[PDB]
Amino acid sequence: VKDTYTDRLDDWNGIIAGNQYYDSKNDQMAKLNQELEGKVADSLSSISSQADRIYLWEKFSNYKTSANLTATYRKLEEMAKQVTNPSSRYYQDETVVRTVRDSMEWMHKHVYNSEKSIVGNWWDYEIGTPRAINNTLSLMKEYFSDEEIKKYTDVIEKFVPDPEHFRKTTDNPFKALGGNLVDMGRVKVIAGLLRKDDQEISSTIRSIEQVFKLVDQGEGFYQDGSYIDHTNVAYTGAYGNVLIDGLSQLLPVIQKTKNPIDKDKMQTMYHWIDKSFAPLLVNGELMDMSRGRSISRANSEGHVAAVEVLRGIHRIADMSEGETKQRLQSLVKTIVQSDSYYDVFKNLKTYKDISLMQSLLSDAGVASVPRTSYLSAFNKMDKTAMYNAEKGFGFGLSLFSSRTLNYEHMNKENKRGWYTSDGMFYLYNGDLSHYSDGYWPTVNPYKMPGTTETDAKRADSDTGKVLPSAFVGTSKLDDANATATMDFTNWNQTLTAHKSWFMLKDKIAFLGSNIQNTSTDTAATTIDQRKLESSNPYKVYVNDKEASLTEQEKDYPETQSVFLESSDSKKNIGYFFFKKSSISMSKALQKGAWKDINEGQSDKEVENEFLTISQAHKQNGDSYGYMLIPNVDRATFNQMIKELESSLIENNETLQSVYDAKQGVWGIVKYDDSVSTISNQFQVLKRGVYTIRKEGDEYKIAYYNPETQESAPDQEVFKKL
Ligand SMILES: CCCCCCCCCCn1c(-c2ccc(OS(N)(=O)=O)cc2)cc2ccc(OS(N)(=O)=O)cc21
C-alpha cells in the first residue's frame, strides 16, 4: 500500500542504491552499474535450481557459519538493485523477480526464521542479515505484498525486539552504543517502516539519540576526541566509521518521520568530524592505529577505510546548510585531492554518493586548500596524531595503558597484532602506499617500528591485555609541539622501559631508559621497519657514508646517524643518535599471506621488501636516544644534526628531556616528584609530562599527569629561576 511509510522507503532506496540518479553517460556511475551487472550475472549462473536444494550457493552453503546467511541475502539485495534500475539488463526481468521472491521464501523456510537460534556469530543474525533483508524488501516493495513483507521481517523482530540491546535471545545480551547502536537503527527503523510500525520507529530513534552524548567513561566519544568501543579499545577508525557511515544514511529518513531528531545535535556531529575523525586522515589515509582488528582485512587498507568516513561526511554536508555545508565540502575536497594513490570512487557504492562527490570536486565554489598543521592528543584512548603542513608529513603514536587494551584479536582476525600498541609509531610521508599493498601480512610482527621487545615466540591464539601502569599520556602545548611517555612493561613481565617521545614541530625524539630484561631472551628496540617501493629505491648512509644493505643483518657500531635518501625529498628519513649507538640494519624480501593474520582472508602469497633498523639491549639499565627527522634532503639533515648536537638534556630512570633551541621549546618527562632544574633557567616539580616554550622572559606551560588524567596550576609544577 502507498503511504508515508513507502514515501520514506522511497527516500531510503534513493540512498542505498540511488537508481533515480543513474546516468549512463556518467563514466563513474556506469562503472558501478557494470560491477552490479556482473555480480547479478554471476549469482544467476551459479544459483542452485534443482528440486529441494540444500543451499542457494555452494560458496555459501554451510549455514552453520553465520557469515553465509548474510552473504546469501546480500546477493539478493544486489538483484533487487538491478531489477529496479531502468538501465540494467535485468530491469524488471521475470526470472530475477521470481528468483528474489523464491529465494526469500526458501531461506525463510529452511534457514532463517523465528524458530531458529543464533548459530555462530550473533552479528549476522541481528545486523548483517536483517539489513540485507530490509534493503531487498524496500527496493522491491512493489513486487511483494504487505503480508509477505511482514512475514519475512518477523524473524528480525524475534532476534532484535529491543532497540537498546543486542544478543537479547542469548544468555548474555549487551547494551547497544556507538556504531552498533547506529546499525540498530538501520535494522529497526527500516523494518519499522516496512512493517508500518510506529512504535518500533519512534522507540528506535529514541534509543539512537544516545549516540550524541559525550561520555567520560566506557564506550563512545570523549571531550578530547577519543572514541572507545568494545569496552576499552581505541576504535575511531572502524566502529566510528560504522557510526558516521550508517548514521549519515539514516538521517535524511529520520528527519522526515514523525519523530525527527532535535536539530541541535548535528552540531555534535560536526564536532565528531573536526575533533575525532579529521585528525586521523592524512593524504587520504585513515590511520591504522585507530582501526583495531580491521587492519588484517585485505579489502580494507587505510585509503579504502578512509572513504567510509569521507562519504559519511559529504552526506552530512548535504543535509547541512550555508557555511557549515561548504566547509565540510572543502574538508572532503582537500583530503580527496591530496590522495594521489587511491581513487576515492573505488569505494563509493551508490549513485548518490558518486553524484555528491562529483559535484563537490567540480564545484569551483568549494575551496580546496592544503590542510594546516595540527596535533591531537587523544589521551582517553592513548593515541596521538601529528601533522606538519609545511614539510608535509604525518606521525602517529600508538600506546595503551591500564585504561585501554593493546590490540584486538577476535573472530580469528588480527592474530599477530601483539605489539601494535607497544609504543609503535607511524610515519606518513610521500609514499602514500606504505601501509597498504600488503603491508600488514608481510611486516615482521616481532619488530613493529618503535617497540622494545624480547625475541620470545608468540602464539596466534593470544588475546589483548591492558598495561599494568596508568602512567601513559601526552601533554600538548600547541599545534606542533607535544610530549608523551609510556611506563612500559612487556606482555609477560620480563622487560621494562621508560619510553618517551618529544614531538618538536618537524621532528620527533625517541628516548628510552631503565631498560631491563629478566628473561633468557634477547631484548632490542626496533628503530624502524619501513616498507620499500621498487620504483623509488633508497640510498642508505651511515655517518654520512653510503652503506650497502643485505638480507643478512649488518652491525654498525659507533653510529651517529643514518639517512635514507630518495629521489623525492618528501620520502627521506633521517635518524640522529644523540650519543653514538650500536645498531644493525638489513633489507630483505618478506613473504606472507593475509590468511596468516586473518582466518577468513586469502591464503595467496604476498611479498614486500623491508628495511629494518634495530638496537640491541644486552644489559640492565640500557637506553636509546635518537631524533627522527623526515622530509629534508641530505645536506639539510647534516646541518640539522649539528644544530641538535646538544639537544638531549637528560635520559635516565627518573628524568627525560629534549630541548629545541631554535623554537625555544622543552619536552620533559618526570617519573618522580624531585626538583628538576632545566637548562639553568627553570625548575619542574612534579611527576608527569611537560611541554614548555620560552618567549622573551615568558614561559608557556603545558603539564599533564597521565595517571590522574589532570593538568595542574602552574605554581604546583613550574618555578622560574
Ligand atoms: C560493544 C562492545 C561489546 C564488546 C564486544 C562484544 C561483541 C562485539 C561484536 C563484534 N563483532 C563480531 C563477534 C562475533 C562473535 C562473538 O562471540 S562468539 N562466542 O565468539 O561467537 C563476538 C563478536 C562479529 C563482527 C563482524 C563485523 C563487525 O564490524 S566491523 N567494524 O566491520 O568489524 C563486528 C563484529
Ligand SMILES: O=C[C@H](O)[C@@H](O)[C@@H](O)CO
Ligand atoms: O611566563 C610567565 C609564567 O608563565 C608565569 O606566569 C607562571 O609562573 C604561571 O603563572
Ligand SMILES: O=C[C@H](O)[C@@H](O)[C@H](O)CO
Ligand atoms: O578515563 C577514560 C579512559 O581513558 C578510558 O580509556 C576507559 O578506560 C575506557 O574503557
Ligand SMILES: O=C[C@H](O)[C@@H](O)[C@H](O)CO
Ligand atoms: O581490559 C580488560 C578488561 O578488564 C577485561 O578483562 C574484561 O573482561 C572486560 O572486557
